[PDB]
Amino acid sequence: LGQVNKYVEQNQNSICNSLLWLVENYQLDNGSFKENSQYQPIKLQGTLPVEARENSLYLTAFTVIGIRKAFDICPLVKIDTALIKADNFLLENTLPAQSTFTLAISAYALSLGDKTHPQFRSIVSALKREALVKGNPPIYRFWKDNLQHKDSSVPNTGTARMVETTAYALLTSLNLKDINYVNPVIKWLSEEQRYGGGFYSTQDTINAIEGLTEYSLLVKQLRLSMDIDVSYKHKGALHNYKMTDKNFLGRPVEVLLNDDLIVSTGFGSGLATVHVTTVVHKTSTSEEVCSFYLKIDTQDIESDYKRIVACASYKPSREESSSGSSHAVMDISLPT
């Protein structure tokens, strides 16, 4: 809402109320926030305690975010004071760096106001220390969930949580106006997103998009004169297009022929995205990275009726804990 406002004035009164409902009754004596419901959005690297200990950091920075977007609708001093009480929680506590997803979000959150706090600057140098890179000079730059070890890999994978972090970081740096430090990063985002949104989950998607955009208005927008061409590696050329500020957006083309792809472009200038999403059907999952003990099957009952029974349990990674999983989905394609 605090964002949608600048284009569609919102029920200020309600925004006020809601803001008041967060802060009035869900802020502890230390400033951190706390969840009412049972819903756990994320699951974080930690031991039975350290876990929650992180989680609290999470919720805190998170809400500091919503609140600090909305606030200009409702600068009630009651809530400005909340901001402070809880920003202080981020500062006094984030720094013994417990994990990069913590770090990054914390960072953005703080970065929404008073980019001058010494402690904040510390948590920022403390983020940059975790930057993973590639190619020298840096061409690709992004963050992972490294806490302690740091295998500076790049696995073609690309995790939601990954884009989420590298995005909270992209944002921290855009609110810092660090424009240079940032290209290696939007070149790693831009290239990640699938055509349409932002691929992995939801949370990353929106922080990404916010990044990419706020950026695309932040830099000095370039004029489009690209001579995009696309051709199969051996089999002939397929379509190709000039690219101007009346062209781009162009039709998504079907790759028909079983043969490699070759997108080159002429001299010209501007910026352009080529993603090529591809789809197929394996016969098997043997290969895949199972993260859930799964089992299922068909029975009977009393009278006579057939019944499915499907189950799960969570395969928790090294750092994870016995807590179980986060908000999750079970999808059960039914026999034709």
From Swiss-Prot:
Residues bearing glycans: 30
Ways its activity is controlled: Membrane attack complex (MAC) assembly is inhibited by CD59, thereby protecting self-cells from damage during complement activation. MAC assembly is also inhibited by clusterin (CLU) chaperones that inhibit polymerization of C9.
The record's subcellular location field reads: Secreted; Target cell membrane
Which cysteine pairs are covalently linked by disulfides here? Answer: 16-74
Q: What does this protein do?
A: Component of the membrane attack complex (MAC), a multiprotein complex activated by the complement cascade, which inserts into a target cell membrane and forms a pore, leading to target cell membrane rupture and cell lysis. Complement C5b is generated following cleavage by C5 convertase and initiates formation of the MAC complex: C5b binds sequentially C6, C7, C8 and multiple copies of the pore-forming subunit C9.
Summarize subunit and interaction data from the UniProt record for this chain.
Complement C5b is composed of complement C5b and complement C5 beta chains that are associated via disulfide bonds. Component of the membrane attack complex (MAC), composed of complement C5b, C6, C7, C8A, C8B, C8G and multiple copies of the pore-forming subunit C9. Interacts with the tick complement inhibitors OmCI, RaCI1 and CirpT1. Interacts with cobra venom factor (CVF).
| Official protein name in the record | Complement C5b
**Record organism:** Homo sapiens (Human)
Kindly list the organism's lineage. Answer: Eukaryota, Metazoa, Chordata, Craniata, Vertebrata
Q: Which residues of the full protein are shown?
A: 1086 to 1430 of 1676
